[PDB]
Structures are given as structure tokens and as C-alpha cells.
Ligand binder design. Structure first.
Ligand SMILES: [Mg+2]
Ligand SMILES: [Mg+2]
Ligand SMILES: [Mg+2]
Ligand SMILES: [Mg+2]
Ligand SMILES: [Mg+2]
Ligand SMILES: [Mg+2]
Ligand SMILES: [Mg+2]
Ligand SMILES: [Mg+2]
Ligand SMILES: [Mg+2]
Ligand SMILES: [Mg+2]
Ligand SMILES: [Mg+2]
Ligand SMILES: [Mg+2]
Ligand SMILES: [Mg+2]
Ligand SMILES: [Mg+2]
Ligand SMILES: [Mg+2]
Ligand SMILES: [Mg+2]
Ligand SMILES: [Mg+2]
Ligand SMILES: [Mg+2]
Ligand SMILES: [Mg+2]
Ligand SMILES: [Mg+2]
Ligand SMILES: [Mg+2]
Lengths: 86, 93, 64, 273, 130
RNA sequence: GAAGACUGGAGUGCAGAAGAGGAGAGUGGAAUUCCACGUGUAGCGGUGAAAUGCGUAGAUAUGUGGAGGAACACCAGUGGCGAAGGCGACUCUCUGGUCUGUAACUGACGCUGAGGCGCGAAAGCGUGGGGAGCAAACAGGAUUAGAUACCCUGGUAGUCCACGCCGUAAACGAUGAGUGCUAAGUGUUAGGGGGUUUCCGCCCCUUAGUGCUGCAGCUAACGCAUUAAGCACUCCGCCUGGGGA
RNA sequence: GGAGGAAAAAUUCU
């Protein structure tokens, strides 16, 4: 994932004018990265270290989503409906 | 991405065929997407070890700035087919 | 004890500069060890990469 | 890939077959079809000269271009489809003139590509050139022996040859059987391997599936009579009570070399298989 | 991590073994209460509360007797996150047969064994020190 | 437990760094074997000694050319990367992780983790290729009282490639993961700050790895000792005399 | 003293 592409991800789901640490932007970036690695793994079957990286980021995103849900429900519903999860 | 392709032409090739190969490769390298920035020519040099039947060669250098990574690929296969080029290398600067 | 590359400040070891590489290769085309020349480890491995790329393109002798 | 059948029936227990996932259309070109009639191994005189032939599904012949003489005209791969008369698949090509011709489908050929032939053709899978201008080491197929005759040497499914060198008037080729052979440099060849390489793995599974292909049963010579086969006769089961196993016409069958010993083409074969 | 009071006790124990004179660590309410208690029974010499804009810190000076004798000879933790301990008013223990003290958090705050048994109240025992 | 507030934990941002981390394609030289051809003649090979074996149908040796396969000399270093197994020729494409620098951002989002899922040296199994060296089984020659062995001459599976199983090891640092505290001295890898200095260089400070010597402390002892086997807390796995097993 | 690499020799028995 190139830096500029991540910059548009940050700019689209930003909460305020200088937000980079909110769970929304982190979840969006993680979703983009895991989609890219899903494509790569679908290409290369037996690259297992990258698959471990996939699993690591999937777990991290799951914990982030659980924290966001336990903090706020409306924001969680908005994220899941905007990014198409579950 | 910036590249640098330096290759060797056979020593017995006369000037006309040598230059013809030069523009042929500089054209088939830029038709697939590339902005050539420099194509110099080291010239006649000896070889530290010999190749198929040659002891000297004409070293040629070209510098690329392509951002598609396919043109180089094409050059590769063409460089492997043409018998005027005896050896080539692509380095990502 | 002095390195060479660090002392002169040169950072990139190009594989086309044959004269620089000729100093770090033995009589029979062998890469000299670090304990003999005194090069820093980082520049030692960079120099070996440059030497191998230069040698592979009929520009430095594999043997002799 | 290779389709595998569940053991629903004893005759379906061990069968495997292709899935035909590479076949684009199921209707042939009507203008390139000719009738075939089964000979059943019967001679010019109505005699059975070759055994174990006859009685399968009826087929129709597809006129296939082996010469590949049409130089300079681009041709697009239109379809890849089934041919009952050979193991490999065939491809229909629409040339720029508006005329259609069949070729053997090489490996890595799919619909929409453009295929050339002649001296100015590039070294791509599907093109055809003379052997005098094909770089050493490439993998080729559909080699011809006499200039202008048409492709003849490598033609089955999954087979391929390789160029080894040049000897001036001739070119060295390593054929699919491992034999190094000298071929005239003016002959033609097609780049690439033939594309139905899964054909080897089919398991017939049924006695009656061989009959759909035109294969009548074969009888061993050990269960015949002494006037039928040199192996016939004997009380109970008997071993091969002879010096060597023999064909039904004499002429030992195990290890005996049958190539002609004074053959003209023996000087063009660098090394045997 | 898990238990800060155990870290407190371990810090004093290590500094006491090394014969260190000064110790500093991040502060809290219960830490200040424990330090004030230890100062009242004279186990330590002095305690200061230094203000830093994260949480604040507490600094204690270890006290040693004449000829380099250790005033504090041991600290043990009783209540743990994996096993809490609560003591009734008639179940409070005497540390080292009355030679030491115990710290107990009851409904009237943090007290020692003598205070807890004087008011006939109970709480949870935090640690023994002797 | 609920409602708020804050950054030390945790993560993102911004700027740099290093690396045999992983998958795919192509290429390079040294050497071994085989084949063809010049020169040349009686031995070569091997062992503690021999012999089997190859050789006058002409070897061994030497020079030229061709075919094919496997492994990557020097660099190379108690150096580096990875969770572990493990990863050394070169180039490109696609990708994982880590360290330092800043304090911009969110504000406890953390640790461990039965049952589950996945990876997992070598040997082995199935299908299809490939096969130069080495080599289980096997044969011959020796040694020996015997030699189903060690030694010598050959040699098949296998070692290699693709896909699919198998799920084991002295899979070891014989040392589970997380966090904090507790004398020093001296090398090395990747960074950062300052002082000397025109640079170079030298000196000091600090973060994260990797070695050695050593204090308190611990141990039955050997020994460990800021990379604890010391002082503490959280969670998991396991032990209860030897054989049978 | 500790760690890494690494040559040459070699009959059987008590
Ligand atoms: Mg038959
Ligand atoms: Mg039969
Ligand atoms: Mg009968
Ligand atoms: Mg008869
Ligand atoms: Mg008989
Ligand atoms: Mg009988
Ligand atoms: Mg016969
Ligand atoms: Mg932090
Ligand atoms: Mg010879
Ligand atoms: Mg805030
Ligand atoms: Mg489990
Ligand atoms: Mg194996
Ligand atoms: Mg196998
Ligand atoms: Mg042996
Ligand atoms: Mg086990
Ligand atoms: Mg163990
Ligand atoms: Mg621990
Ligand atoms: Mg360290
Ligand atoms: Mg020690
Ligand atoms: Mg112990
Ligand atoms: Mg040693």
C-alpha cells in the first residue's frame, strides 16, 4: 500500500481536521491492507509468512472493532455500514 | 522507479549495424512506457573473462525512469533473442 | 585500522568504478577479508555486492 | 482439471475424466467438416489386417491447417473447441481476409490473441517460422520434415521439442522421445508446447468406455490353441515354453529390434533414444 | 501491571537489601497512605511528594540504625489479584507476635492492626511488614 | 457497576536505517561425470598390506568441443533476519516483520489463553518428470577363529522439481509468556545527541540486539548473576519411587 | 582460559 493511497484513506474517514489515531481511520487502513494481502495470497499459495501477517492484522482489527463497539454503538454501526463488514 | 540498463554488443559488428541495434533497442524500450533520460556509450573494452567466442565488446549504457515495470521485461526477452547483445543487466537505482 | 570509505566520506560504491574495486581484490580475483583491509562492516558488504555485480558482467575476473 | 467420480456404482468407482474447462464453444465450423467412415482395420481387400479396431461413436473430420502458409496476415483466436479425431484441442482463427482455418491449440493460447506466421513473426506462442530463424533453446512443436509439406513430427497433446543448434544447411532438434535429429533448416515449426497436457491422467474405469473409442477386446496368446498362436496349447496353465516370447506370426517380441538395418535416413540421426 | 502495591513493597525490599538510602516511584493515593503509615511507625525516615505532570511521584528515604542495622527486615504481600483476603474484626492477625505491624483497609480507611482492633472494625489485609 | 476526566501502557501519524525474512521468473562461473576427436604407451586405481575393478579392442595423462544435473569457493564474522523449523551466487516482480528519531494523533483500545485453526528439519507415502555426484538394500574383494560390520570396487530406491499426505527429533539455552526493581568492567551489530577537531579522527551520553568476566542474592553442587537459575505479581502447561510402558 | 575452522597418520587379540 503506497503512502498516498493511505493518505486518501486517512482523509476520507478522518474525524476532525487533524485526526489520525481514531479507530475509524485505523480500521479503514487495516481493511484496505488486508484486502491487498488477500489478493496477494490468492496469487501466491505457499507464502506463509505473509499469511501470518494477514492473521495478525485481522486479529488487531477485531480487537479495535470490539473496543469501538463497547465505547459507542452508533459509530460502530456507521463504520460497518460504510465499509461493508460482516 | 529509476533503472539503469548496461549491455554489451559484439566486437565485430560494424558501425551501421551497431547503431541500428542501438536505436532498435532504445525504441523497443520506450514504446512500452518509459522516459529515457540518458543513453551514453562506453565503447570498446576488453573482457576479464571470455564469452561465447569474443574477448572484447562494446559497452552501452541507458538510464530509465519508467514507472510500469513492463517495458524492462520486454527488453529482457528481446535482449535474450538478439544475437548482437551478448550480455545485459538491469539495476534498480 | 582506518576504514577508507568512512574516512573519505564516500557513501555509495558504484559497480562501474573498476579502479576502486581493484584495490580490494587479491592477485587471483578473490575478495580480501575485512581484517586485512580494515573496511567497516556495512561498507564491506556494500563493496562485496558491488564487486559481485561488476564481476558478473565480464568486468572483473572470476579467477586469476 | 481432472474430474473424479464418487463410488456410486462399481463401474463408476475408479473413473476420472476431464472437465473441459478450456473449451469455449460446442458447435464446429460447418464449412470445415468432412465425413469419416470407420474402416475397422479392414484392408483394401476387406481383410482384417490390424486387430482390436472397430465399433465406436461416429465422428466427422475437421480440416486442420498444418502447413501454415499464410504469411503476413494477422489472425485472431476465435474459439477453442473439441476434436474427436485427436488428443489435442483445436482453435478456430479468423484471418483479416475473412477466411477461417483450424490449428492445433498450443499451451497458453486463449481467445482474443493475434497469431502471425512468416519471416517477420515474433517468437511468441502460436506463431510459425522457418527453423533457420528460430533462436537456439526454444521449445517448439508441429515440426515438418520436407519444406512445404506441413507439420508432422510433434503433434500429440502435451508434447514438445527443443532446438539444440545449427549445422549450416541443417538444424539439430531433440524430439519428444529423446532422439537428437537433423532437420532441414528451411522447414517450419510452431512455438510452444501442445496444450492438453492433462490427457495422460484419464482413468477409463469401464470396460464399455473403451468400446466407445473403437477398441475391441484383446485375447492373450496363452489361452489359444497350438494352431492359433505359438503360445497356445498345454494342459492347465502353461508358461512360455519357448526360448523367447513370440508374436502371433513368429518373430520374437521382447527386446528384438525391428528397424531396418540399411535405412537411408540413418545418417541424419545424431543419437538414438 | 496487575499489582502496583506489590511493586512498591518489592522496591523497598530491593533498596533495603542493596543498602540504598533513597527511592522514588510513581505516586497514588494508596501509595501515599502506605508511606505515611510507614513513617508513623518509623520504618522509614522521610517521604516527599514531587509534582510532575503525569501522575506525581513519591520519594522515601530508607532508615538504618546504628552500626548499619536494617530497620526494615521484611515485607510480605497478603492480598493478591488472584486471591483476595478479607479479615474480620476478631480475625485480624498480630505480625511477628506484636513486634511488627500489618496494614488493613477497612471502612474507615487504611489502618494498622492496633487501630483496627481498637475500633473493632475489619477490612482487607494488604501486607505484613517487620 | 454507571457517568466523566488524563497520558506512563497500547496503536497510528511524520523522518530515517539495516537485514541469507517469504513466494515467482530468468541468468552466471568453478568443478565432477558421459560422448566425439588429436598426441602418447603399459600400466592406472586402492589399502595398515592387498585384492576385486578399468586397460594393448589401448587406458591413466594431456589439448579441443558438446550434453546434462546438483551445490553456490573467497566475502564469512560466539555477524544478520525470522514465532519456531530455518534462511548463504546474481537480477527483477509481488510481499511480512523489526529498530531508532519526533510528540502530531486516539485515549486503557492491555496480558495470558483450556477447547479450535495454522506452520513445522530429516526420513517415509501417492501421481508425473529429472537423474551429474553421493548413497539404505544388494554383489564382489579383503580383515577375522567367525565378520550378516568397520576398509576397497560397483550399485537400486532416495537425495532434485510440481501438487497432495504424513506431523516426528538431543524440534535444546535440556531454561513458557507479560511487566517492574536490583554493583561494575570490556568487545561487537543498527541508530540518535554533545564536545575536541577545518575535515578525518578521538572523547562523553543514550535506545534496541548479540558475546565474555564478575557484587549482592539464589543453588545439593556444578554454577546463574540487567540476555538471572536474584527480588515480586498475572495467566497457561506439566511432575509425585524404578521396571512392566 | 573460552568460542570457530581445520590438516597428516591408522593391522587383529589380551
Ligand atoms: Mg492392440
Ligand atoms: Mg487381454
Ligand atoms: Mg483353451
Ligand atoms: Mg506352432
Ligand atoms: Mg506353450
Ligand atoms: Mg500343469
Ligand atoms: Mg509379430
Ligand atoms: Mg510508546
Ligand atoms: Mg581424456
Ligand atoms: Mg483528547
Ligand atoms: Mg491447544
Ligand atoms: Mg524429505
Ligand atoms: Mg517420491
Ligand atoms: Mg561403500
Ligand atoms: Mg515429542
Ligand atoms: Mg525439551
Ligand atoms: Mg519470566
Ligand atoms: Mg546489551
Ligand atoms: Mg558469568
Ligand atoms: Mg534451580
Ligand atoms: Mg576448539
Amino acid at each position: 500500500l503506497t503512502q498516498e493511497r493511505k493518505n486518501e484513506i486517512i482523509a476520507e474517514y478522518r474525524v476532525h481536521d487533524t485526526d489520525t489515531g481514531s479507530p475509524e481511520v485505523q480500521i479503514a487502513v487495516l481493511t484496505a491492507e488486508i484486502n491487498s494481502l488477500n489478493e496477494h495470497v490468492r496469487v501466491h499459495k505457499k507464502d506463509h509468512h505473509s499469511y501470518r501477517g494477514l492473521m495478525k492484522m485481522v486479529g488487531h482489527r477485531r480487537n479495535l472493532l470490539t473496543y469501538l463497539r463497547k465505547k459507542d454503538v452508533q459509530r460502530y454501526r456507521e463504520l460497518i455500514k460504510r465499509l461493508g463488514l460482516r | 522507479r529509476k533503472y539503469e540498463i548496461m549491455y554489451i554488443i559484439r566486437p565485430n559488428i560494424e558501425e551501421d549495424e551497431k547503431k541500428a541495434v542501438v536505436e532498435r533497442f532504445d525504441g523497443i524500450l520506450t514504446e512500452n512506457g518509459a522516459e529515457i533520460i540518458e543513453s551514453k556509450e562506453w565503447g570498446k573494452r576488453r573482457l576479464a573473462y571470455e564469452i561465447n567466442d569474443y574477448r572484447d565488446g562494446f559497452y552501452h549504457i541507458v538510464k530509465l525512469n519508467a514507472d510500469k515495470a513492463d517495458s524492462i521485461n520486454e527488453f529482457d526477452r528481446l535482449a535474450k533473442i538478439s544475437d548482437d547483445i551478448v550480455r545485459h543487466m538491469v539495476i534498480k537505482e | 585500522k582506518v576504514c577508507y570509505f568512512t574516512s573519505n566520506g564516500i557513501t555509495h560504491i558504484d559497480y562501474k568504478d573498476v579502479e576502486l574495486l581493484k584495490k580490494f581484490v587479491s592477485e587471483r580475483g578473490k575478495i580480501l577479508p575485512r581484517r586485512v583491509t580494515g573496511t567497516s562492516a556495512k561498507y564491506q558488504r556494500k563493496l562485496t555486492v558491488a564487486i559481485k555485480r561488476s564481476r558478473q558482467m565480464a568486468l572483473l575476473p572470476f579467477v586469476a | 482439471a481432472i474430474k473424479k467420480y464418487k463410488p456410486t456404482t462399481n463401474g463408476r468407482r475408479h473413473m476420472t475424466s476431464s472437465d473441459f474447462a478450456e473449451i469455449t464453444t460446442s458447435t464446429p465450423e460447418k464449412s470445415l467438416l468432412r465425413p469419416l467412415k470407420k474402416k475397422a482395420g479392414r484392408n483394401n481387400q476387406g481383410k482384417l489386417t490390424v486387430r482390436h479396431h472397430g465399433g465406436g461413436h461416429k465422428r466427422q473430420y475437421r480440416v486442420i491447417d498444418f502447413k501454415r502458409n499464410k504469411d503476413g496476415i494477422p489472425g485472431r483466436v476465435a474459439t477453442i473447441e473439441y476434436d474427436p479425431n485427436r488428443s489435442a484441442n483445436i482453435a478456430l482463427i479468423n484471418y483479416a481476409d475473412g477466411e477461417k482455418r483450424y490449428i492445433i491449440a498450443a499451451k497458453g493460447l486463449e481467445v482474443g490473441q493475434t497469431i502471425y506466421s512468416g519471416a517477420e513473426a515474433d517468437i511468441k506462442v502460436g506463431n510459425a517460422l522457418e527453423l533457420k530463424d528460430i533462436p537456439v533453446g526454444t521449445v517448439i512443436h508441429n515440426i515438418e520434415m520436407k519444406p512445404g509439406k506441413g507439420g508432422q513430427l510433434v503433434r500429440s497433446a502435451g508434447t514438445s521439442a527443443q532446438v539444440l543448434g545449427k549445422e549450416g544447411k541443417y538444424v539439430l532438434i531433440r524430439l519428444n522421445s529423446g532422439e537428437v535429429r537433423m532437420i532441414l533448416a528451411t522447414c517450419r515449426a510452431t512455438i510452444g508446447q501442445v496444450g492438453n497436457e492433462q490427457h495422460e491422467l484419464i482413468n477409463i474405469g469401464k470396460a464399455g468406455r473403451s468400446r466407445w473409442m473403437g477398441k475391441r477386446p484383446t485375447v492373450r496368446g496363452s489361452v489359444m490353441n497350438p494352431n492359433d498362436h505359438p503360445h497356445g496349447g498345454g494342459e492347465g496353465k502353461a508358461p512360455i515354453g519357448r526360448k523367447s516370447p513370440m508374436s502371433p506370426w513368429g518373430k520374437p517380441t521382447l527386446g528384438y529390434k525391428t528397424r531396418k538395418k540399411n535405412n537411408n535416413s540413418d545418417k541424419f540421426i545424431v543419437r538414438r533414444r | 501491571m496487575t499489582d502496583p502495591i506489590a511493586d512498591f513493597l518489592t522496591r523497598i525490599r530491593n533498596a533495603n537489601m542493596v543498602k540504598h538510602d533513597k527511592l522514588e516511584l510513581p505516586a497514588s493515593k494508596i501509595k501515599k497512605e502506605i508511606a505515611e503509615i510507614l513513617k508513623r511507625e518509623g520504618f522509614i525516615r522521610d517521604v516527599e511528594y514531587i509534582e510532575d505532570d503525569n501522575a506525581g511521584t513519591i520519594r522515601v528515604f530508607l532508615k538504618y540504625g546504628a552500626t548499619g542495622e536494617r530497620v526494615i527486615t521484611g515485607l510480605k504481600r497478603i492480598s493478591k489479584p488472584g486471591l483476595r483476603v478479607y479479615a474480620k474484626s476478631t480475625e485480624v492477625p498480630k505480625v511477628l507476635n506484636g513486634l511488627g505491624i500489618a496494614i488493613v483497609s477497612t471502612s474507615q480507611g487504611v489502618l494498622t492492626d492496633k487501630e483496627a482492633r481498637a475500633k473493632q472494625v475489619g477490612g482487607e489485609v494488604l501486607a505484613y511488614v517487620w
